Amino acid sequence: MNSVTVSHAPYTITYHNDWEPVMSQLVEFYNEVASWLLRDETSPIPDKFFIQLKQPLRNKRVCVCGIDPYPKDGTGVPFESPNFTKKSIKEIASSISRLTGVIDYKGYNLNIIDGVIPWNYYLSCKLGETKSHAIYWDKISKLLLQHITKHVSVLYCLGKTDFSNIRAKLESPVTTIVGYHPAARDRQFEKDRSFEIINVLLELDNKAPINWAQGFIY
Amino acid sequence: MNSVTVSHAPYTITYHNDWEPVMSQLVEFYNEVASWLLRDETSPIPDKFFIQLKQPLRNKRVCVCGIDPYPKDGTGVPFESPNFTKKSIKEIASSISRLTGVIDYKGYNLNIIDGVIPWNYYLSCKLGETKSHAIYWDKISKLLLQHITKHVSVLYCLGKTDFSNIRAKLESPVTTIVGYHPAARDRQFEKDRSFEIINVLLELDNKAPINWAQGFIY
Ligand SMILES: O=c1cc[nH]c(=O)[nH]1
Ligand SMILES: O=c1cc[nH]c(=O)[nH]1
Ligand SMILES: [Cl-]
Ligand SMILES: [Cl-]
Ligand SMILES: [Cl-]
Ligand SMILES: [K+]
Ligand SMILES: [K+]
């Protein structure tokens, strides 16, 4: 676990060694755009922007990727809602409940699942405004996700319109699924088969399925 | 069925209307390289290069794709061996035999199966030399396979090394699986569950299964 310093808040970024190859470019890129980010109140707060860089990558086989943090109360862990109030994670838990038979739970967290790294393409938004920092994270977003696709077997992105151009953006050889976002119109998410498809493709790729029930909190 | 003219042999390419949108570009790319390509004796003969363009695409939900034709005796139909002598198709048949329970058969052809189009990424080779014509087919190969992946639900490529970067070339929402080639050492093809898993993937995509037993000749 090393760290590097950046000129603007949060001033230091702690990271796992698996990220070493991109940290130099990340410092340079972040120093360029950070003033744009910090003039607004943000979700998450700046000290939590990069908290997922503490996660290893070599033991990951699925990236679960949303476009950017919750408009409010983002923790720096994508989808995480400590009090289980956010619609997105509740919808995800409901789907996993249906697939796993786990009916009694108090919460759900993608970040405690073996082999899964939850990710947000953009690492912040202006408080209460989705995708408001897209232009500023852009170069960093491509850099960091491309780095993740060097490790994982499956990239699962949520939001058909949000991720409309993801394949041209990454130019990756990795398996990529773009599914419905939890708030997609007409409850399309609950019929989405992506969690099942991911496991079929992993086992095809000679990897263990994801045990999605590990995400539950009791 | 319409046809177009090319400047060198086979001179006329007849095609089903489903291929209409790539034909002008095909003519242009083929005219650019045919003079160099036709320095060699080929598998298949030039009059059979394009015979699969006679197939419709709108009723196809799976493409089974090899790298290029048999080094000798290619017929223009990928994997096809009229006398059932070639190793690849014998291994394919054996795999489908175990999957289906069909024990007595005299041959197997991937081209007589409802919903399947068998394909070769490169449409010829120099006689007796595998992948020898990749230099000539390059642009055509991308053009044609990309068009197929706008119609099929699953793309099944044979050759882990040959197709390792294929999802970056296609940049497609199609579900692409890359499996072992029939002649993979330590008999890895025999362990491969791709043919079986194709129907699982199709079901998740709300499509009908393939009846792989239609491929048998008796
Ligand atoms: O972190 C989050 C939360 C909701 N939606 C996302 O895309 N990411
Ligand atoms: O047509 C063929 C024959 C052998 N191998 C392939 O990949 N395709
Ligand atoms: Cl969506
Ligand atoms: Cl063979
Ligand atoms: Cl192989
Ligand atoms: K969001
Ligand atoms: K071949």
XYZ file of C-alpha atoms and ligand atoms in Angstrom:
457
model
C 0.000 0.000 0.000
C 1.712 3.146 -1.294
C 0.542 6.717 -1.834
C 1.194 9.764 -3.993
C 0.530 13.448 -3.366
C -1.628 15.736 -5.511
C -1.594 19.543 -5.418
C -5.298 19.886 -4.556
C -7.681 18.164 -2.135
C -7.683 15.423 -1.017
C -3.889 16.052 -1.388
C -2.885 12.398 -0.859
C -4.126 9.259 -2.658
C -3.494 5.890 -1.004
C -3.561 2.902 -3.400
C -2.950 -0.845 -3.754
C 0.110 -1.883 -5.833
C -2.116 -3.316 -8.610
C -2.843 0.312 -9.581
C 0.855 1.371 -9.787
C 0.970 1.447 -13.620
C -1.574 4.332 -13.823
C -0.774 6.432 -10.740
C 1.749 8.692 -12.499
C -0.735 9.623 -15.248
C -3.469 9.902 -12.597
C -1.520 12.506 -10.579
C -0.875 14.598 -13.715
C -4.472 14.280 -14.966
C -6.038 15.038 -11.566
C -3.827 18.105 -10.951
C -5.136 19.536 -14.251
C -8.871 19.233 -13.480
C -9.222 19.204 -9.686
C -10.091 22.905 -9.343
C -13.179 22.306 -11.516
C -14.312 19.526 -9.177
C -13.700 21.347 -5.890
C -15.663 24.559 -6.640
C -18.892 22.572 -6.162
C -20.093 20.591 -3.177
C -19.624 16.965 -4.306
C -20.828 13.389 -3.854
C -18.765 11.881 -2.491
C -16.671 14.347 -0.476
C -13.132 14.649 -1.987
C -11.419 12.493 0.704
C -13.542 9.574 -0.612
C -13.074 10.153 -4.373
C -10.427 7.458 -4.744
C -11.212 5.035 -1.914
C -11.712 2.096 -4.376
C -8.025 2.373 -5.397
C -7.292 0.641 -2.081
C -8.864 -2.502 -3.608
C -6.738 -5.210 -5.253
C -7.319 -6.041 -8.929
C -5.543 -9.382 -9.533
C -8.187 -11.278 -7.540
C -11.069 -9.615 -9.453
C -12.962 -11.145 -12.387
C -16.070 -8.934 -12.652
C -16.253 -5.144 -12.648
C -19.750 -3.846 -11.858
C -19.772 -0.303 -13.209
C -22.191 2.600 -12.751
C -21.813 5.990 -14.439
C -21.161 8.151 -11.331
C -21.897 8.422 -7.561
C -25.298 8.861 -5.938
C -26.313 12.532 -6.408
C -26.270 12.722 -2.606
C -24.581 10.687 0.166
C -22.109 8.820 -2.067
C -19.500 7.082 0.125
C -16.812 6.516 -2.482
C -17.858 2.837 -2.655
C -20.106 2.578 -5.726
C -23.757 1.773 -4.957
C -23.040 1.585 -1.212
C -25.872 2.786 1.013
C -24.931 2.085 4.664
C -28.534 2.684 5.803
C -29.975 0.842 2.755
C -32.165 3.748 1.603
C -31.008 4.287 -2.007
C -33.281 2.861 -4.707
C -30.443 1.550 -6.902
C -28.927 -0.827 -4.333
C -32.338 -1.909 -3.022
C -33.313 -2.876 -6.588
C -30.027 -4.760 -6.997
C -30.624 -6.607 -3.704
C -34.197 -7.441 -4.758
C -32.895 -9.039 -7.980
C -30.223 -11.025 -6.123
C -32.809 -12.048 -3.510
C -34.926 -13.489 -6.342
C -31.964 -15.389 -7.834
C -30.534 -16.687 -4.525
C -33.650 -17.354 -2.438
C -32.370 -15.008 0.283
C -35.545 -13.228 1.442
C -34.557 -11.878 4.890
C -31.795 -9.276 4.845
C -31.082 -5.762 6.131
C -28.834 -4.493 3.317
C -26.609 -5.263 0.347
C -23.103 -4.222 -0.683
C -21.364 -5.123 -3.970
C -17.993 -4.337 -2.389
C -17.963 -7.386 -0.028
C -18.372 -9.937 -2.876
C -15.418 -12.184 -3.757
C -14.181 -11.479 -7.307
C -16.251 -8.304 -7.784
C -14.977 -4.725 -7.953
C -17.760 -2.156 -7.956
C -16.798 0.923 -9.986
C -18.090 4.334 -11.015
C -16.965 5.626 -14.402
C -16.923 9.233 -13.121
C -15.640 9.526 -9.541
C -17.756 12.510 -8.485
C -20.779 14.577 -9.310
C -21.825 18.064 -8.295
C -24.071 17.547 -5.268
C -27.572 16.551 -6.441
C -26.760 16.520 -10.178
C -25.951 13.285 -12.031
C -23.104 13.315 -14.597
C -22.339 16.968 -13.829
C -18.582 16.191 -13.657
C -18.366 14.040 -16.806
C -16.178 16.447 -18.739
C -13.637 16.752 -15.925
C -13.172 13.048 -15.086
C -13.229 11.916 -18.738
C -9.472 11.272 -19.291
C -9.028 9.781 -15.826
C -12.209 7.704 -16.296
C -10.900 6.068 -19.472
C -7.430 5.587 -17.950
C -8.746 3.867 -14.825
C -11.440 1.677 -16.391
C -9.061 0.516 -19.151
C -6.739 -0.505 -16.329
C -9.558 -2.510 -14.690
C -10.344 -4.277 -17.988
C -6.756 -5.571 -18.020
C -7.637 -7.619 -14.919
C -11.310 -8.617 -15.024
C -12.951 -11.205 -17.283
C -16.361 -9.438 -17.440
C -17.230 -5.719 -17.437
C -20.882 -5.219 -16.501
C -22.056 -1.638 -17.012
C -25.493 -0.426 -15.858
C -27.385 2.154 -17.946
C -27.982 1.688 -21.671
C -27.870 5.397 -22.506
C -25.118 6.250 -19.995
C -22.850 3.576 -21.507
C -23.981 3.883 -25.157
C -20.406 4.439 -26.415
C -18.426 2.411 -23.825
C -16.971 -0.108 -26.325
C -15.454 2.496 -28.672
C -14.246 4.348 -25.568
C -12.320 1.411 -24.060
C -11.358 -0.547 -27.188
C -11.076 -3.589 -24.906
C -10.942 -7.360 -25.712
C -12.827 -8.081 -22.468
C -16.392 -9.386 -22.300
C -18.684 -6.364 -21.872
C -22.377 -6.391 -20.944
C -24.370 -3.146 -20.884
C -27.595 -3.689 -18.940
C -30.489 -1.639 -17.647
C -29.946 0.787 -14.804
C -32.173 0.121 -11.743
C -34.184 3.295 -12.557
C -34.678 2.376 -16.268
C -38.236 3.128 -17.437
C -41.075 0.677 -16.844
C -39.176 -1.540 -14.363
C -36.968 -3.067 -17.085
C -34.202 -3.735 -14.517
C -36.094 -6.479 -12.636
C -36.371 -8.567 -15.835
C -32.713 -7.963 -16.804
C -30.763 -11.264 -16.810
C -27.262 -9.759 -16.463
C -26.316 -11.329 -13.100
C -27.155 -14.748 -14.560
C -25.441 -14.057 -17.905
C -22.241 -12.980 -16.100
C -21.966 -16.342 -14.336
C -22.615 -18.281 -17.554
C -19.812 -16.341 -19.279
C -17.385 -16.734 -16.365
C -17.855 -20.525 -16.239
C -17.390 -20.565 -20.032
C -14.150 -18.629 -19.457
C -13.023 -21.311 -16.953
C -13.624 -19.096 -13.897
C -15.781 -19.530 -10.815
C -19.216 -17.927 -10.873
C -19.872 -14.896 -8.662
C -21.579 -15.784 -5.408
C -23.918 -12.768 -5.457
C -25.449 -13.735 -2.084
C -22.154 -12.689 -0.422
C -23.344 -9.085 -0.885
C -26.138 -9.468 1.692
C -26.007 -7.803 5.109
C -27.917 -9.326 8.049
C -30.710 -12.835 -55.791
C -28.522 -9.998 -57.020
C -24.866 -10.083 -57.936
C -21.976 -7.652 -58.256
C -18.934 -7.648 -60.485
C -15.332 -7.738 -59.283
C -12.257 -7.068 -61.422
C -10.629 -10.489 -60.898
C -11.761 -14.070 -60.387
C -14.366 -15.163 -59.426
C -15.576 -12.032 -61.362
C -19.200 -12.201 -60.124
C -20.345 -12.487 -56.514
C -23.955 -13.532 -56.046
C -25.468 -12.592 -52.697
C -28.674 -12.721 -50.669
C -30.287 -9.302 -50.052
C -29.407 -9.425 -46.304
C -25.759 -8.731 -47.338
C -26.688 -5.721 -49.558
C -25.255 -3.066 -47.162
C -21.647 -4.398 -47.335
C -21.441 -5.312 -51.043
C -20.095 -2.031 -52.495
C -17.359 -1.919 -49.827
C -16.633 -5.628 -50.434
C -16.116 -5.020 -54.171
C -13.769 -2.115 -53.430
C -11.664 -4.018 -50.853
C -11.556 -7.200 -52.951
C -10.436 -5.343 -56.109
C -7.566 -3.835 -54.057
C -5.963 -7.175 -53.123
C -7.192 -9.912 -55.527
C -4.250 -9.538 -57.932
C -1.784 -10.392 -55.129
C -4.008 -13.104 -53.593
C -4.452 -14.873 -56.943
C -0.687 -15.432 -57.282
C -1.444 -18.544 -55.167
C -3.416 -21.734 -55.552
C -6.140 -21.541 -52.936
C -8.403 -23.424 -50.605
C -11.143 -23.060 -51.592
C -11.026 -22.272 -55.320
C -11.916 -18.615 -56.066
C -15.392 -19.550 -57.393
C -16.205 -20.802 -53.880
C -14.713 -17.940 -51.792
C -18.050 -16.184 -51.392
C -20.653 -18.932 -51.446
C -21.796 -18.251 -47.866
C -22.993 -14.801 -49.028
C -25.856 -16.751 -50.559
C -27.192 -17.486 -47.053
C -29.784 -15.247 -45.396
C -28.834 -13.554 -42.102
C -32.262 -12.502 -40.737
C -33.111 -16.048 -39.606
C -29.681 -16.585 -37.971
C -29.121 -16.374 -34.234
C -25.711 -18.100 -33.931
C -22.534 -17.716 -35.949
C -19.929 -20.475 -35.584
C -16.717 -18.969 -36.820
C -13.411 -20.586 -37.737
C -10.212 -18.749 -38.679
C -9.925 -19.841 -42.315
C -10.620 -22.802 -44.661
C -9.053 -26.263 -44.560
C -5.502 -26.018 -45.991
C -6.674 -28.473 -48.635
C -10.141 -29.307 -50.017
C -12.014 -26.313 -48.592
C -15.448 -26.084 -50.211
C -16.430 -22.497 -49.365
C -18.686 -23.807 -46.601
C -16.730 -23.525 -43.307
C -15.849 -26.925 -41.720
C -17.587 -28.867 -44.495
C -16.053 -32.196 -45.523
C -18.246 -34.075 -48.073
C -16.486 -37.391 -47.331
C -16.300 -36.614 -43.570
C -12.526 -36.997 -43.476
C -11.311 -33.727 -41.920
C -10.329 -33.759 -38.261
C -12.108 -30.521 -37.260
C -15.619 -31.559 -38.333
C -15.124 -35.101 -36.977
C -14.308 -33.539 -33.587
C -17.307 -31.180 -33.873
C -19.584 -34.154 -34.660
C -18.210 -36.115 -31.679
C -18.865 -33.193 -29.369
C -22.433 -32.850 -30.699
C -22.878 -36.655 -30.422
C -22.076 -36.571 -26.675
C -24.369 -33.541 -26.203
C -27.338 -34.953 -28.164
C -27.048 -38.730 -27.693
C -26.915 -39.354 -31.446
C -24.496 -42.298 -31.821
C -25.057 -43.472 -35.420
C -24.192 -40.954 -38.131
C -22.111 -40.832 -41.309
C -21.263 -37.125 -41.228
C -21.984 -33.645 -39.917
C -22.474 -30.246 -41.561
C -22.878 -26.983 -39.632
C -24.560 -25.332 -42.662
C -27.806 -27.376 -42.551
C -28.850 -26.284 -39.053
C -31.722 -23.842 -38.559
C -30.493 -20.634 -36.939
C -26.771 -21.247 -37.521
C -24.393 -19.680 -40.049
C -20.899 -21.237 -40.078
C -18.228 -18.732 -41.046
C -14.496 -18.415 -41.719
C -12.884 -15.126 -40.687
C -10.462 -15.273 -43.658
C -12.141 -16.600 -46.812
C -9.131 -18.387 -48.351
C -5.664 -19.657 -47.629
C -2.686 -20.407 -49.845
C -3.027 -24.139 -50.540
C -1.525 -26.091 -47.629
C -0.777 -23.035 -45.443
C -3.035 -22.017 -42.545
C -3.668 -18.264 -42.040
C -1.488 -17.485 -45.063
C -4.032 -15.064 -46.563
C -4.743 -12.951 -43.470
C -2.755 -10.154 -45.132
C -5.229 -9.992 -48.046
C -8.535 -10.569 -46.230
C -7.900 -8.236 -43.242
C -10.334 -5.422 -44.147
C -12.924 -7.639 -45.796
C -12.849 -10.010 -42.824
C -13.720 -7.218 -40.400
C -16.413 -5.857 -42.728
C -18.212 -9.161 -43.192
C -18.035 -10.407 -39.577
C -19.263 -7.061 -38.225
C -22.255 -7.332 -40.541
C -23.000 -10.854 -39.261
C -22.837 -9.643 -35.643
C -25.691 -7.165 -36.377
C -27.947 -10.193 -36.918
C -26.796 -13.045 -34.687
C -27.288 -13.207 -30.939
C -24.178 -15.296 -30.194
C -20.827 -15.427 -31.959
C -18.848 -18.588 -31.240
C -15.229 -18.333 -32.430
C -12.914 -21.345 -32.558
C -9.244 -20.668 -31.738
C -8.166 -19.113 -28.430
C -5.049 -17.477 -29.875
C -6.509 -16.642 -33.286
C -9.533 -14.855 -31.820
C -8.071 -13.527 -28.529
C -8.550 -9.848 -29.505
C -11.795 -10.320 -31.527
C -14.112 -8.311 -29.217
C -11.858 -5.252 -29.713
C -12.062 -5.644 -33.527
C -15.831 -6.066 -33.668
C -16.820 -3.461 -31.083
C -20.213 -5.195 -30.996
C -23.044 -5.789 -28.462
C -23.215 -9.408 -29.725
C -22.353 -12.061 -27.160
C -18.975 -13.407 -28.250
C -17.509 -16.610 -26.897
C -13.992 -17.735 -27.796
C -13.399 -21.472 -27.409
C -10.649 -23.984 -28.187
C -10.126 -25.096 -31.783
C -10.953 -28.792 -32.483
C -7.197 -29.638 -32.803
C -6.095 -27.989 -29.510
C -3.370 -30.104 -27.866
C -4.155 -32.181 -24.770
C -7.621 -32.560 -26.370
C -9.032 -29.397 -24.785
C -11.795 -29.027 -27.365
C -13.424 -32.232 -26.059
C -13.841 -30.676 -22.586
C -15.367 -27.475 -24.061
C -19.035 -26.825 -23.148
C -19.576 -24.031 -25.710
C -22.095 -25.837 -27.920
C -24.243 -26.659 -24.894
C -23.882 -23.204 -23.321
C -24.893 -21.477 -26.579
C -28.508 -22.600 -25.966
C -28.372 -21.335 -22.361
C -27.164 -17.911 -23.626
C -29.865 -17.907 -26.339
C -32.590 -18.632 -23.732
C -31.362 -15.717 -21.612
C -31.604 -13.576 -24.784
C -35.239 -14.713 -25.297
C -34.289 -16.642 -28.458
C -35.053 -20.223 -29.466
C -32.466 -22.965 -29.004
C -30.367 -24.490 -31.760
C -31.185 -28.140 -32.556
C -27.575 -29.223 -33.091
C -28.745 -32.724 -34.188
C -29.935 -31.183 -37.486
C -26.264 -31.138 -38.513
C -25.979 -34.938 -38.720
C -25.859 -36.740 -42.034
C -27.010 -40.386 -41.943
O -22.557 4.654 -7.063
C -23.540 4.649 -7.824
C -24.805 4.788 -7.290
C -25.900 4.786 -8.147
N -25.701 4.655 -9.470
C -24.456 4.515 -9.965
O -24.286 4.418 -11.201
N -23.392 4.517 -9.152
O -13.573 -24.186 -42.512
C -12.754 -24.394 -41.598
C -12.045 -25.579 -41.611
C -11.131 -25.813 -40.610
N -10.946 -24.889 -39.657
C -11.644 -23.740 -39.651
O -11.436 -22.900 -38.741
N -12.550 -23.499 -40.616
Cl -30.954 1.903 -18.812
Cl -8.984 -30.100 -39.605
Cl -7.265 -23.090 -29.343
K -25.588 8.170 -10.456
K -7.934 -23.675 -41.083
